[PDB]
Design a protein around this nucleic acid. Structure first.
Ligand SMILES: [Mg+2]
Ligand SMILES: [Mg+2]
Ligand SMILES: [Mg+2]
Ligand SMILES: [Mg+2]
Ligand SMILES: [Mg+2]
Ligand SMILES: [Mg+2]
Ligand SMILES: [Mg+2]
Ligand SMILES: [Mg+2]
Ligand SMILES: [Mg+2]
Ligand SMILES: [Mg+2]
Ligand SMILES: [Mg+2]
Ligand SMILES: [Mg+2]
Ligand SMILES: [Mg+2]
Ligand SMILES: [Mg+2]
Ligand SMILES: [Mg+2]
Ligand SMILES: [Mg+2]
Ligand SMILES: [Mg+2]
Ligand SMILES: [Mg+2]
Ligand SMILES: [Mg+2]
Ligand SMILES: [Mg+2]
Ligand SMILES: [Mg+2]
Ligand SMILES: [Mg+2]
Ligand SMILES: [Mg+2]
Ligand SMILES: [Mg+2]
Ligand SMILES: [Mg+2]
Ligand SMILES: [Mg+2]
Ligand SMILES: [Mg+2]
Ligand SMILES: [Mg+2]
Ligand SMILES: [Mg+2]
Ligand SMILES: [Mg+2]
Ligand SMILES: [Mg+2]
Ligand SMILES: [Mg+2]
Ligand SMILES: [Mg+2]
Ligand SMILES: [Mg+2]
Ligand SMILES: [Mg+2]
Ligand SMILES: [Mg+2]
Ligand SMILES: [Mg+2]
Ligand SMILES: [Mg+2]
Ligand SMILES: [Mg+2]
Ligand SMILES: [Mg+2]
Ligand SMILES: [Mg+2]
Ligand SMILES: [Mg+2]
Ligand SMILES: [Mg+2]
Ligand SMILES: [Mg+2]
Ligand SMILES: [Mg+2]
Ligand SMILES: [Mg+2]
Ligand SMILES: [Mg+2]
Ligand SMILES: [Mg+2]
Ligand SMILES: [Mg+2]
Ligand SMILES: [Mg+2]
Ligand SMILES: [Mg+2]
Ligand SMILES: [Mg+2]
Ligand SMILES: [Mg+2]
Ligand SMILES: [Mg+2]
Ligand SMILES: [Mg+2]
Ligand SMILES: [Mg+2]
Ligand SMILES: [Mg+2]
Ligand SMILES: [Mg+2]
Ligand SMILES: [Mg+2]
Ligand SMILES: [Mg+2]
Ligand SMILES: [Mg+2]
Ligand SMILES: [Mg+2]
Ligand SMILES: [Mg+2]
Ligand SMILES: [Mg+2]
Ligand SMILES: [Mg+2]
Ligand SMILES: [Mg+2]
Ligand SMILES: [Mg+2]
Ligand SMILES: [Mg+2]
Ligand SMILES: [Mg+2]
Ligand SMILES: [Mg+2]
Ligand SMILES: [Mg+2]
Ligand SMILES: [Mg+2]
Ligand SMILES: [Mg+2]
Ligand SMILES: [Mg+2]
Ligand SMILES: [Mg+2]
Ligand SMILES: [Mg+2]
Ligand SMILES: [Mg+2]
Ligand SMILES: [Mg+2]
Ligand SMILES: [Mg+2]
Ligand SMILES: [Mg+2]
Ligand SMILES: [Mg+2]
Ligand SMILES: [Mg+2]
Ligand SMILES: [Mg+2]
Ligand SMILES: [Mg+2]
Ligand SMILES: [Mg+2]
Ligand SMILES: [Mg+2]
Ligand SMILES: [Mg+2]
Ligand SMILES: [Mg+2]
Ligand SMILES: [Mg+2]
Ligand SMILES: [Mg+2]
Ligand SMILES: [Mg+2]
Ligand SMILES: [Mg+2]
Ligand SMILES: [Mg+2]
Ligand SMILES: [Mg+2]
Ligand SMILES: [Mg+2]
Ligand SMILES: [Mg+2]
Ligand SMILES: [Mg+2]
Ligand SMILES: [Mg+2]
Ligand SMILES: [Mg+2]
Ligand SMILES: [Mg+2]
Ligand SMILES: [Mg+2]
Ligand SMILES: [Mg+2]
Ligand SMILES: [Mg+2]
Ligand SMILES: [Mg+2]
Ligand SMILES: [Mg+2]
Ligand SMILES: [Mg+2]
Ligand SMILES: [Mg+2]
Ligand SMILES: [Mg+2]
Ligand SMILES: [Mg+2]
Ligand SMILES: [Mg+2]
Ligand SMILES: [Mg+2]
Ligand SMILES: [Mg+2]
Ligand SMILES: [Mg+2]
Ligand SMILES: [Mg+2]
Ligand SMILES: [Mg+2]
Ligand SMILES: [Mg+2]
Ligand SMILES: [Mg+2]
Ligand SMILES: [Mg+2]
Ligand SMILES: [Mg+2]
Ligand SMILES: [Mg+2]
Ligand SMILES: [Mg+2]
Ligand SMILES: [Mg+2]
Ligand SMILES: [Mg+2]
Ligand SMILES: [Mg+2]
Ligand SMILES: [Mg+2]
Ligand SMILES: [Zn+2]
Lengths: 205, 58, 105, 159
RNA sequence: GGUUGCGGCCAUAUCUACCAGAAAGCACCGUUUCCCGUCCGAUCAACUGUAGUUAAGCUGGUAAGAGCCUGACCGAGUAGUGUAGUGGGUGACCAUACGCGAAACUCAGGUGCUGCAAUCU
RNA sequence: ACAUUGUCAGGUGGGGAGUUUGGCUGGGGCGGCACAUCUGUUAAACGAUAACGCAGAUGUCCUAAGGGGGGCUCAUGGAGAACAGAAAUCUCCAGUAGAACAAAAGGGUAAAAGCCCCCUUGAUUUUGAUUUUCAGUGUGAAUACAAACCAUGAAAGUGUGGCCUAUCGAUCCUUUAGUCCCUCGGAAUUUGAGGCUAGAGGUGCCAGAAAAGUUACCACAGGGAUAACUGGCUUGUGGCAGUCAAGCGUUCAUAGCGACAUUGCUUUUUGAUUCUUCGAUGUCGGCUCUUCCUAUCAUACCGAAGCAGAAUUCGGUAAGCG
RNA sequence: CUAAUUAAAACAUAGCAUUGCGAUGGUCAGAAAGUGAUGUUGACGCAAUGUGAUUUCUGCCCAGUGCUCUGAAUGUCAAAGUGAAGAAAUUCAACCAAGCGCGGGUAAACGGCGGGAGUAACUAUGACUCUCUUAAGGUAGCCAAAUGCCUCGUCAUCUAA
RNA sequence: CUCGUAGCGGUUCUGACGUGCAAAUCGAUCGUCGAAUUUGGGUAUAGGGGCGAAAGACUAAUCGAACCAUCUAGUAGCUGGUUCCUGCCGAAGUUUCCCUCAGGAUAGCAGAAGCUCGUAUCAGUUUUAUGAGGUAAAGCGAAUGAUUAGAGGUUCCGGGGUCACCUUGACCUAUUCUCAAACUUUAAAUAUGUAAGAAGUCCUUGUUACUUAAUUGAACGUGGACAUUUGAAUGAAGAGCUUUUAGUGGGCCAUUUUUGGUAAGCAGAACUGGCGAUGCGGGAUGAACCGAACGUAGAGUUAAGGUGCCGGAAUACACGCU
């Protein structure tokens, strides 16, 4: 009572979002996009591992659940559920239609899928450096729930941030880094010095 | 029975068989839509110029 | 549609030829009048055997007629015709829009 | 059904061009248009009178008529397999002068000036434009410029 | 150079906060008989530059200010894209050839200019 | 002197006569209107562009919601006032429009095109030009002028309906307005009629017949431009496989299973399509008879078991033979 | 009885019932007629229908439609005729038969003959009750019937099935 | 009433036959067989008529309106056919309207007849200058709309929890992950408008009832100066103009961009090239693919594709892989 995903595998249509014209879209069954120890400090989880798409296709929300649960459960079992942070980095925003014999054959909403490119991250995990084999094995287990080809790239970035590991260490053993609840805030050379003293005391030495 | 509604296929090749024509401009276009008060004064300004070049040569 | 029964408008009176005051009323058509040439021809054509000879219109679609105002000049007694758009209701008398006042019924 | 009104498919054409809404600046109303001037057509969306059809956006024509607030413009329009002359009645906020007819008139004045300095002496001054020419012989020095470059780069992912 | 009246281009001019402004001007300010206008001489109108004042307006400056503007071989010849092949690949797509070529980003710089008239240590 | 009969007039009259019973269309019928239209998108940055494409809208409404002028600024929030609270009024501050502008949607608009007030009828007259639909015909709608007459304001100016993009209609006939004008043909006068110019009454199937069904008793012209059955493409659906392994299997993922996912194959299901056949390819099932496939029920030989024996279960070669 | 694909359950039939008509009439012919069929007839008859031997019964409904009725005679109404005004053509007005309208009858005329809820000292069941509309709300009977979709309904019997 | 001959029918074999003996027969088996029986002859009823124990049966092998002749060669937007050769040119399946959708008109495409002139008149092209556009991309710590996760800020905005407390809804503030055919500040490429001059430019002064405070301007002029490098490139095959008329108004395929659909050798659009309308070489074969378009021959060289043999051409040379 569900069409196989090869029917809706490829990005054949313009993106059909839930809008004021769609109005009757069933709910995405992936609803949790951060898992593990999501509240952890940027300094806690320096190593970032990425599951990256090699193909231009669509990932169903069913497949996103089925891979998220598998990677989460392998990492929870082998390494404990507070030793990793998992982020689904795609959201199923495209509505797939089904026409359930060709007069008036415009389809009603079937489901929700996520349009991915070559080189988009689907899942990102940050851990300690000693958890690398468990994370790579969890993501390679999560590969089987996704159609197409996906590579496991070790990021050269500290955590979920967008700067390199020696650059982040040069930035935090100097004074341009202060913590947020799960992410971090950086100090700039621009803005009022009264506010850049109100935050970041540890710089200007 | 259902058929082919519309296509613009072959229409540019037909239009270039005789090779789309520019409308062949002339000195002295018409006064079509030119302002009537300007036209009324232009009539008298050309009447007086016809008489001026008549008296200039004779 | 509310239209006043008096209008200060142009007159083609040839002793007015200017804006004058007009008494405004509606135009109703008029009696169809036997001895019009089409009625004479129609009676002769419908005479005898042969049944109905002209088309009889059936498939009407409009629920409105255009309102024709009959503009009678108060000065020279010459008249004019103005057409208004399709309205389902047309008045001529008073009851202007008293605006800043609480509603009724 | 289908819809082919006067301003159909004009959602973006007659839009008013971010942070330039509101009143029209006054040089638009103080520019002077003579009959025979070559004007560009771009409809202001904030003035609905005298407004050209959407076909005439980006079209360039000749003033044939001048009126109280408007000019008439000849535009050639390709109807089928020929060109028809269209006469437009456009207010002057939908109208601007063509800068091409500026540039060509200073080229006319330059041509007359260099022909005058050729008549003063030195005839055959060669006063047509030329396309861009193939470059001549250079000598390239190696003075503080010793040619030093490496190879193609290895692949790294940097993700 | 300041200031006024009238502008042009419409933020390099705006916004937030603070500090200065001589001279003239502008301004606030003073009065209600008159023309006029309000529930209210607050606004609008009239009258006096008199009773007073630079407090505000206004102008100018400051700010690792926000915004805006300019530039950069900063990203980036990247993305995209015209043309070509009996190129590759099951496909999805991709590479090469001949061309065109972004935006965000990152840096650095800037923060009204100017026309007519009049006036002023 | 009524019946009768003759003539005319009203009624009745499928007894009978004649005719009609729209179109598009993933066959037709039913439905819908994609049939005259408008906004956004489809639409591939000039224009044009299809589908019974997507989301909507039109057959109205308005003497102001038209026109001109003047004053003011809206939505929303915050901070305060007896009743009074989240909502009644009043005051201040912020507020680039997050409001409003009749009605769809898009565009536009801030000393305004919004709101409120004052004055008005330019929503008038004459007849051309132009734009959009386009054949550069009509119709609808719109633009800019010209000749007048007006309105408004101190004025510059603006105003030929609705801030713009939809809101509508030939010929024939009837009717009204206009000149007091043409004609009634032997000459007049007066009624009547006909005419010229401008509107209305209406054709929505919206360039505009006057129109109910049925036929299995049927007919003809045709049509594979088009359905019913084979074939062909496809494979949603049906059927048959695989990968991954949460979990079941007294402990134990994988003996046997196997969720959430995902990749395929087949053409023995049913849809989808309409390419072939309508100057005809005999349309269900059974009987009879042959061959072929293997995705193997049995039989032969094996591997595995939660296979002690027995009986089973999973799997391999295999279609030889039933 | 469908000659030449259907011999039947179809048609007819006796029986039953309804309708019209008393003759210058009913029903039906004919272009007309000093013309016809019934009719060399007369209500135990002719004509038009329906149902279909016997037995037993034939319920309710006159709102609709049809049919019918010395039925109401200022609702509608044509031609002629009448009146007014007009120079007259003509226009207007009053009167205006039948029919329609109004009212009544009629189903062995055409036909038609419902839903829900609350209720018994069982749980559903509902003699009873209530409104919702009706013209009446399917009566006596009969039935998965040659009439029941679901359906190969349920039970019994028949069979090894 | 019955069994059953003759007779009169016509059940079943769905027998025979089915280019027959026969355009309805043959055989067996059947229904009925003393009356609503069967039958001859005479007579009556005639075509919108008859007759019908009713089947639309029958009315001379003809019946849901017989047969004959005439009107009549009825009409057909529909189907078939349409008769000698060679030469030259050569389409369309698209626009608008139509009870239009198997048809017409109309525009286009096409031929013919030419006419006015004779070097550049112009161009499916580039350059230079100058416009216009809101698609691809991009963006969301920019608006609108979606959307993930935390953090910071104390409250009768009805948290219980002192009557100021771990376990507060939010709301705001700075961040964070991800997006949009009907979102957007920004914004290509390709496509698209104009111009690149003698009808041009300057100098002087003539007209007028328009215009200005005013010959101020406007428009058109006189007279004068400027000679092909006279105002980019390349080409021009002559250029421009006119009348008339045929066929067509079913299209289809490929690359790219697209819509609907799971999809389709599916349905529908956009740009170009093709097939139709077209042979030739190659892809074994084939409407469309590659190459190349064709008078009749000869020689040479090639394209695409090939070179073991079928088969013309190296069982070439080389580096590996299997
Ligand atoms: Mg399946
Ligand atoms: Mg699609
Ligand atoms: Mg995978
Ligand atoms: Mg049809
Ligand atoms: Mg067609
Ligand atoms: Mg096309
Ligand atoms: Mg052609
Ligand atoms: Mg053409
Ligand atoms: Mg008449
Ligand atoms: Mg006559
Ligand atoms: Mg009407
Ligand atoms: Mg539109
Ligand atoms: Mg718009
Ligand atoms: Mg724009
Ligand atoms: Mg308007
Ligand atoms: Mg005061
Ligand atoms: Mg009598
Ligand atoms: Mg008579
Ligand atoms: Mg009748
Ligand atoms: Mg009748
Ligand atoms: Mg009839
Ligand atoms: Mg259909
Ligand atoms: Mg229909
Ligand atoms: Mg259509
Ligand atoms: Mg049309
Ligand atoms: Mg385009
Ligand atoms: Mg376009
Ligand atoms: Mg679509
Ligand atoms: Mg459509
Ligand atoms: Mg409509
Ligand atoms: Mg105002
Ligand atoms: Mg309204
Ligand atoms: Mg037209
Ligand atoms: Mg025409
Ligand atoms: Mg229209
Ligand atoms: Mg208008
Ligand atoms: Mg005017
Ligand atoms: Mg209007
Ligand atoms: Mg208007
Ligand atoms: Mg309005
Ligand atoms: Mg208004
Ligand atoms: Mg006619
Ligand atoms: Mg007339
Ligand atoms: Mg005469
Ligand atoms: Mg005479
Ligand atoms: Mg006479
Ligand atoms: Mg006379
Ligand atoms: Mg008369
Ligand atoms: Mg008359
Ligand atoms: Mg008129
Ligand atoms: Mg009319
Ligand atoms: Mg039409
Ligand atoms: Mg039309
Ligand atoms: Mg036939
Ligand atoms: Mg076919
Ligand atoms: Mg399929
Ligand atoms: Mg299948
Ligand atoms: Mg399948
Ligand atoms: Mg498999
Ligand atoms: Mg185990
Ligand atoms: Mg055939
Ligand atoms: Mg056969
Ligand atoms: Mg096998
Ligand atoms: Mg086996
Ligand atoms: Mg054996
Ligand atoms: Mg065998
Ligand atoms: Mg066998
Ligand atoms: Mg027979
Ligand atoms: Mg027979
Ligand atoms: Mg029988
Ligand atoms: Mg028989
Ligand atoms: Mg019968
Ligand atoms: Mg007799
Ligand atoms: Mg019977
Ligand atoms: Mg009985
Ligand atoms: Mg009754
Ligand atoms: Mg009478
Ligand atoms: Mg009664
Ligand atoms: Mg009774
Ligand atoms: Mg009876
Ligand atoms: Mg009944
Ligand atoms: Mg009962
Ligand atoms: Mg029953
Ligand atoms: Mg039974
Ligand atoms: Mg039965
Ligand atoms: Mg007997
Ligand atoms: Mg017997
Ligand atoms: Mg026999
Ligand atoms: Mg036989
Ligand atoms: Mg017998
Ligand atoms: Mg018998
Ligand atoms: Mg017997
Ligand atoms: Mg007997
Ligand atoms: Mg006997
Ligand atoms: Mg005889
Ligand atoms: Mg007879
Ligand atoms: Mg007859
Ligand atoms: Mg018969
Ligand atoms: Mg005959
Ligand atoms: Mg003939
Ligand atoms: Mg023939
Ligand atoms: Mg040729
Ligand atoms: Mg045909
Ligand atoms: Mg045909
Ligand atoms: Mg033509
Ligand atoms: Mg030609
Ligand atoms: Mg865009
Ligand atoms: Mg667009
Ligand atoms: Mg693109
Ligand atoms: Mg995009
Ligand atoms: Mg965002
Ligand atoms: Mg698009
Ligand atoms: Mg944008
Ligand atoms: Mg050129
Ligand atoms: Mg011809
Ligand atoms: Mg056709
Ligand atoms: Mg196709
Ligand atoms: Mg053909
Ligand atoms: Mg070819
Ligand atoms: Mg080839
Ligand atoms: Mg070949
Ligand atoms: Mg091949
Ligand atoms: Mg090629
Ligand atoms: Mg050739
Ligand atoms: Mg050989
Ligand atoms: Zn008058």
């Amino acid at each position: 009572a569900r069409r196989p995903a090869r029917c809706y595998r490829y990005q054949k249509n313009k993106p059909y979002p839930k809008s004021r014209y769609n109005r009757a879209v069933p709910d995405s069954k992936i609803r949790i996009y951060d898992l593990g120890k999501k509240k952890a400090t940027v300094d806690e989880f320096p190593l970032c591992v990425h599951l990256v798409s090699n193909e231009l296709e669509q990932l169903s929300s069913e497949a996103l659940e089925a891979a998220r649960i598998c990677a989460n459960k392998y990492m929870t079992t082998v390494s404990g559920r507070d030793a990793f942070h998992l982020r689904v980095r795609v959201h199923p925003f495209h509505v797939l239609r089904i026409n359930k014999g060709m007069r008036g054959a415009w389809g009603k909403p079937h489901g929700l899928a996520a349009r991915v490119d070559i080189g988009q991250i689907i899942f990102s995990v940050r851990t300690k450096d000693s958890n690398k084999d468990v994370v790579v094995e969890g993501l390679r287990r999560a590969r089987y729930k996704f159609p197409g080809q996906q590579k496991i790239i070790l990021s050269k970035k500290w955590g979920f941030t967008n700067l390199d590991r020696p650059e982040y260490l040069k930035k935090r053993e100097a004074g341009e880094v202060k913590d947020d609840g799960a992410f971090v805030k950086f100090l700039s050379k621009k803005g009022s010095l009264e506010n850049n003293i109100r935050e970041f005391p540890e710089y200007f030495a | 029975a259902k058929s082919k509604n519309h296509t613009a296929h072959n229409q540019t090749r037909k239009a270039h068989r005789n090779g789309i024509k520019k409308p062949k401009t002339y000195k002295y276009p018409s006064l079509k839509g030119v302002d009537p008060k300007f036209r009324r004064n232009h009539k008298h300004a050309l009447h007086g110029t016809a008489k001026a070049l008549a008296a200039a040569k004779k | 549609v509310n239209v006043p029964k008096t209008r200060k408008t142009y007159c083609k009176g040839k002793t007015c030829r200017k804006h004058t005051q007009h008494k405004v009323t509606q135009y109703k058509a008029g009696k169809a009048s036997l001895f019009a040439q089409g009625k004479r021809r129609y009676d002769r054509k419908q005479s005898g055997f042969g049944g109905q000879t002209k088309p009889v219109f059936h498939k009407k679609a409009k629920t409105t007629k255009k309102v024709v105002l009959r503009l009678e000049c108060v000065k020279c007694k010459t008249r004019a015709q103005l057409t208004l758009k399709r309205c389902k209701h047309f008045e001529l008398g008073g009851e202007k829009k008293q605006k800043g006042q609480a509603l009724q019924f | 059904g289908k819809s082919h009104g006067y301003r159909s498919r004009t959602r973006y054409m007659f839009q008013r061009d971010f942070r330039k809404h509101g009143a029209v600046h006054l040089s638009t109303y103080l520019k002077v248009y003579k009959v025979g001037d070559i004007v560009d057509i771009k409809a202001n969306g904030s003035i609905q009178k005298g407004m050209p059809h959407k076909f005439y956006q980006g079209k360039t024509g000749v003033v044939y008529n001048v009126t109280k607030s408007s000019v008439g413009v000849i535009i050639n329009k390709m109807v089928g397999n020929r060109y028809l002359e269209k006469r437009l009645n456009l207010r002057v906020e939908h109208i601007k002068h063509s800068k091409c007819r500026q540039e060509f008139l200073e080229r006319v004045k330059a041509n007359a000036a260099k022909r005058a300095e050729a008549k003063a002496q030195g005839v055959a001054v060669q006063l047509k434009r030329q396309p861009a020419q193939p470059r001549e012989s250079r000598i390239v020095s190696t003075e503080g410029n010793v040619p030093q470059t490496l190879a193609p780069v290895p692949y790294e992912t940097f993700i």
